[PDB]
Symmetry: D2
Subunit: 268 residues, 4 copies
């Protein structure tokens, strides 16, 4: 099943869509600057693109920076849309936020941590917007159908499943490449995308992991990069250096183009 | 570090406290009847007891029973407290709930899935109530120190750490019995309790697992019962065993291996 | 199902048996000295005791110490048995070793890393000796019935199942305390014992872990001790075992409670 | 580091080599028929090829078919080499087997289950043959360096590291795609290959898993087939390999990008 996000076609047998940006909104200028680089690179290479950012980071330490908030975040997203003409994605945290965020933001994201909170799921469903569901590290690929069921019952079937790794002992994640296939098979072939950033604790391996994931035939890649850099723990420890964006994406796109040009081979 | 909950002294070198009750409040009478059974059994045996129940089930299906809700829930807890003269514990899911729930409920519980929601942690901290922190299946015993830090930063140090198992592959949980010690050593010897019910698959294994856990020298046992859950009629036979073991473990000085 | 080892009754509802000793044999004197400490303490407390040691360490690095070897190892074991009149246990690594080792050693042990080696299982089985099966970190409790079936087919039912923890991510073990019961239920209630030593992170945690395991109602406890792989400090042996026994006596004094 | 195996260049930046064959040798006839198909397909597509088979299955249940055995096994291998002029690979289980197996078989394989058995490692190293090290499901990628160090100490540096998945709870494996990079970085960029067959549960997932692995830039792919739970249907080999080769050629055409 494909989903339409404005001009973009999202689906497991379509050219991959980049859901790309930064961990959290810092300011209007930094946002436009970082977004512009993503927009120029994506236009150059011909990759469908949706700008990603959180306006709030609700797990942040008490007196540490957590974002700009809902009011100024939505203002920044409005400007990104007006300036670049692209779709955007952000995450929602309380049921009340859903309708107003859904007015501006084209895709609304269910945090992995809140993935089981029924009122949030219902509230998101009611908006009618495309929804990105982050798969929790503690949930099996087959347990995702229950979240999908819940959304369907609440009357919204435009769902994206986003992989971010699974708990592997203490203080460690592993990405089960077989999980992509299980989610395709058991959730009606909804678009599946890969959050390579949050599957990682360091950036050196980001390309190898991304390429492996995309080799499995996916609707898209979800990725964060540094902005106008805030070094000491501000951008996320696995964020890609922004200047490498082109060199990175050119390889992802070449791989994706190859996989998608070959018909699906059933092994029976 | 010991914590006072009315007359109860809760601590890792104190007689174990039973955090016992049901999954969700359904009706006043049903709650009173089941609570009465716990109260009678625990007073008979001489085990400090705190009655547990949720007033809402925020994660259950659209097509399921989701509880009596806050307003009704608090009324029931008020009645439980007045009738039996015991403390109670419930979970909270939203910052705005904390102050009203904390007016009635002696212990307020941070749900595992919300363990890292800062706004909730702050709102719970501000009540000044004793807090029960549910340890998520995906967090290491070391990572728990970070939640404890948040609470301290928010001005509340009356914290309980509650073990409920850790993720072990897909759809399976294992309880790392070493994690109790790691939490004790790294989180300032705050009270550690064991949620045996949510650690389990089959109820058949509940005594064996509860005894294993309590053998590591813990402040309390957290369990649910039903007339998954322990059958309510077996509560006395079950508690006799836990108490015998707890009393034995606590009668022998901590043997430090070095 | 109980197993008799000379005058010892080993079983999941009998007083726990201590399988205790050292990692590797080094010399006669040192072996007698350490066994003497164990024997003194276990005789005093009234705990059935079986002395454990390897004669070989086949995974050790090339330039590391490996033990005294088979021939010298058996002589030491003969001497240990002669002096103290207790049963002994050692591990075997090759089919040919099984018969001569079994003539001397009361319990022979299948190493975790070789637990699936059919020819080794067959040769151990044929001795008719009591066998201790070390559960591998990568095997589930229900996969152990496959090892048990193998011993049965080869004609030996005097089997002990020995828990030592399970792979938990990279570089960590966790002991699933529920696994004891699953092995009890699906492997015909064979004696289950707990290797607390090879389960462990740092020794400091040995008492807490041993007590947790024994709380589940087990046939025995398996530990190694150090000079004073985090073995127990030898000078703490008595204080340690007083607590294990006290707990084991309490658990065993109460009839099994079926939860239904 | 590259390894020469006859005319084949094996390395993490060379065209991928296929280590392909069957679980176990049953007869010469059946071996030749299956190998013939591999040879034809790999020749047509231009993929370097090494035929794989075990002559023995040391972990099978007692009365399951265990393979033809060493003597008959080496004869079959000799005929494979004579008929097709290709290199071959097989696994060894005892030190005494190593020199005679190494005479015939170009690559000798250390089983996952025996990975830490020092005597076998040493006996394998002394042959001077190319060695495939199977990574155990319970060893971390950084623990592999210790096996490599042993082989280096015992005189052999022609080593291949073979991924086959890691323990993930009970009776489940996961392949950590990051492990390939970690092995390359910490073990001197030795050739790393991927056993998709043993990593798997249902054969339906074989292509996706294999492509994912090879996307990480590897020296080779390791698989079993069968005319027709995990083995690839022999008739799909061409279609399968067309896709692996297309992905491999692309990845290997692009300069390594280090994220800095
Ligand atoms: Cl995110
Ligand atoms: Cl956050
Ligand atoms: Cl998560
Ligand atoms: Cl990482
Ligand atoms: Cl609860
Ligand atoms: Cl719930
Ligand atoms: Cl949880
Ligand atoms: Cl060893
Ligand atoms: Cl093991
Ligand atoms: Cl193999
Ligand atoms: Cl085998
Ligand atoms: Cl293995």
């Amino acid at each position: 099943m494909d989903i339409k996000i404005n001009d973009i076609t999202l689906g497991n047998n379509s050219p991959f869509v980049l859901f790309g940006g930064i961990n959290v909104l810092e300011s209007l200028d930094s946002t436009l600057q970082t977004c512009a680089h993503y927009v120029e690179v994506t236009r150059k290479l011909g990759i469908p693109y949706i700008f990603k950012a959180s306006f709030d980071k609700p797990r942040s330490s008490i007196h540490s920076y957590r974002g700009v908030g809902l009011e100024e975040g939505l203002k920044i997203f409005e400007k990104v849309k007006a300036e670049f003409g692209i779709p955007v994605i952000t995450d929602v945290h309380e049921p009340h936020q859903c309708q107003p965020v859904a007015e501006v933001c084209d895709v609304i994201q269910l945090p992995a941590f809140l993935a089981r909170q029924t009122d949030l799921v219902v509230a998101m469903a009611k908006t009618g917007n495309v929804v990105n569901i982050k798969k929790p590290q503690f949930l099996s690929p087959s347990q995702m159908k229950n979240i999908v069921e819940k959304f369907h019952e609440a009357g919204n079937g435009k769902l994206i499943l986003c992989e971010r790794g699974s708990s592997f002992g203490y203080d460690n994640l592993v990405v089960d490449m077989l999980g992509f296939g299980v989610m395709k098979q058991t959730c009606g072939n909804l678009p599946v995308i890969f959050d390579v950033t949050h599957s990682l604790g360091r950036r050196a391996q980001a390309l190898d992991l991304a390429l492996a994931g995309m080799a499995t035939r996916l609707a898209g890649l979800f990725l964060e990069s540094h902005p106008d850099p805030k070094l000491a723990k501000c951008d996320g420890p696995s964020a890609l250096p922004l200047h490498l964006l082109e060199d990175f994406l050119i390889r992802i796109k070449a791989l994706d183009d190859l996989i998608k040009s070959q018909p699906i081979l059933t092994i029976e």
